[PDB]
Structure formats: structure tokens, C-alpha cells
Design a protein around this ligand. Structure first.
Ligand SMILES: *c1ccc([N+](=O)[O-])cc1C(=O)Nc1ccc(C(N)=O)cc1
Lengths: 267, 11
């Protein structure tokens, strides 16, 4: 069982973890420390409109006529850094940069959104989500209470995050999982699926071994984690449905400027 | 915009 192959898979896992730590300053460990009240360096809780206004000093403004579209434009602009970090991470995946460059772009242009949601789950618990770079905490029920269609923006991400966070993955697990997401041979428009699957097969072996070594308590964790890719994709494609809801909405879609800024840090 | 951002980041 501990043979040259398994050692190579552990080396791959370590390589990915190291690149992950280098590429992603916001780790799950850091997020969970905040969420479980361990960093004494502590987020202000925004749980209603009153606390929202009282948090005005802590929401820094960074920056369409539709508020929702402006939010999406802002968050997608703010996501560039994440996209660049994920792309940088992908370069560390053995074989990735040797793929047809079109396929690299295709893999990343689908994968980055799923990875952003995966990492967003690290910032979430059942109560809410860290915002303002770990400096604020926006409650899930406050977000859910906002007038349509805003109240529906984040709840499916929370529903996912609760189910995903129940897997108790750590950054070592996530480093490989994210690589498996990127090396998805099923993306539309892929030119050469087989070299992608060759890499993903290696990453999957590495992930399977990682999860066996790291989660003795979890039956079928590998399968359960792979099934979460279904939920991730669903969340991404739900954004298309949200856009249609927004264009059809004729009710008031005003939103407090601080909520707009908060949503722009979300995805 | 995204494909260009990724293409650039891959450089
Ligand atoms: C940004 C900020 C907030 C939300 N939200 O609360 O739903 C969403 C966004 C956003 O634009 N997310 C997003 C962008 C792009 C894709 C995509 N290309 O598939 C999905 C989701």
C-alpha cells in the first residue's frame, strides 16, 4: 500500500498544498479560526438593517443602472484577483501548462467559479458569511430577508456550504479538490479531453488517498466530495436563472449602498 | 473578459 505510487501521490498532494498556500492567502484554517472565535485581531456582525448602518465605518467602498447588475459587475471585477490566484495555482498542477492553451483557458473559465464557491464555503457557517476581509460577518437570515431578488442571491450558496462544510475538509484536502475541479474533462469546448483526464485521474488518486489518510471517520468521503461538484455547478448555473429573475422583476430593486458593497465582496 | 483575464494570468 505504501509503494512508489502512493509516495508520489503524497508528494503531489504536498506540492498542491504548498502551491495552494502560496496562491490563496485566505485559507479555510484562517476562516474557521475567525468563525469559531479564535482570532483576537473580531468581525462585526451585521444581522439586520440597524446593525448594517452601525457597521458603516467598517464597510470600505472600493469602486449599470440596475443595482443587481452593478453588484454582479462589481463582484466579478473584484473576483479577478481570485481568478488570477486560481490560475496561478493551476500552473502548479503537473501537466496543466502542457495542455492545449485553449483547453487551459476553458478549464479555468468554468472551474474558477466553482472554486470561488468552494472557497466561499470556508467563509460560511450556518449563521452567515465573513465579509470585508474577515472584518465583518453578514448573517445568512439577514441576507435571506432582503427584498427580492436579493434575498435569493446567497441562500443556495449557504445551503451548499452547510452540506460542503459538513465534510470537514481542511486546506490539504481542498488543495487537491480544487485541482480536480480544474481538470474536469466534461467542460464544453474542450479540444483534447484525454490529457485532461490523465491529469485528473492522477489528482483523483491523490485525492482518494488524501481523504483516506486524513478522514478515517468518513465513509465514502471521496464519493461525497465528488458529488459536491454537482452542487457547485448547480450554484454557478443558477446565476443564469438569477439574471432572468432580475430582468423580469418590476418591483422595487433598490438596495442599501452598504448592502450593495457587501454583495460586491460576495459571489 | 474572463477568458482574457485567464489567458493573461497564464502568461
Ligand atoms: C457577485 C456578487 C454577489 C452575487 N450573489 O450574491 O449572487 C453574485 C455575484 C456574481 O456575479 N456571481 C457570478 C459571476 C459569474 C458567474 C459565471 N460566469 O458563471 C457565476 C456567478
Amino acid at each position: 500500500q505504501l509503494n512508489p505510487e502512493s509516495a508520489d501521490l503524497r508528494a503531489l498532494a504536498k506540492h498542491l498544498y504548498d502551491s495552494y498556500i502560496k496562491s490563496f492567502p485566505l485559507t479555510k484554517a484562517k476562516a474557521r479560526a475567525i468563525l469559531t472565535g479564535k482570532t483576537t485581531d473580531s468581525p462585526f456582525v451585521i444581522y439586520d438593517m440597524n446593525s448594517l448602518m452601525m457597521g458603516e465605518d467598517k464597510i470600505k467602498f472600493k469602486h449599470s443602472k440596475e443595482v443587481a447588475i452593478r453588484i454582479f459587475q462589481g463582484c466579478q471585477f473584484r473576483s479577478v484577483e481570485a481568478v488570477q490566484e486560481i490560475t496561478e495555482y493551476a500552473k502548479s498542477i503537473p501537466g496543466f501548462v502542457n495542455l492545449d492553451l485553449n483547453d487551459q483557458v476553458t478549464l479555468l473559465k468554468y472551474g474558477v467559479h466553482e472554486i470561488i464557491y468552494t472557497m466561499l464555503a470556508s467563509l460560511m457557517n450556518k449563521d452567515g458569511v465573513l465579509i470585508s476581509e474577515g472584518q465583518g460577518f453578514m448573517t445568512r437570515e439577514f441576507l435571506k430577508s432582503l427584498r427580492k431578488p436579493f434575498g435569493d442571491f446567497m441562500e443556495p450558496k449557504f445551503e451548499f456550504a452547510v452540506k460542503f462544510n459538513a465534510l470537514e475538509l481542511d486546506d490539504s484536502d481542498l488543495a487537491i479538490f480544487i485541482a480536480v475541479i480544474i481538470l474536469s474533462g466534461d467542460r464544453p469546448g474542450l479540444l483534447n479531453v484525454k490529457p485532461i483526464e490523465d491529469i485528473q485521474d492522477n489528482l483523483l488518486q491523490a485525492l482518494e488517498l488524501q481523504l483516506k489518510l486524513n478522514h478515517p471517520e468518513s465513509s465514502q468521503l471521496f464519493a461525497k466530495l465528488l458529488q459536491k461538484m454537482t452542487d457547485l455547478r448547480q450554484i454557478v448555473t443558477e446565476h443564469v436563472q438569477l439574471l432572468q429573475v432580475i430582468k423580469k422583476t418590476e418591483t422595487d430593486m433598490s438596495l442599501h449602498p452598504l448592502l450593495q458593497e457587501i454583495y460586491k465582496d460576495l459571489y | 473578459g474572463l477568458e482574457d483575464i485567464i489567458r493573461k494570468a497564464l502568461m
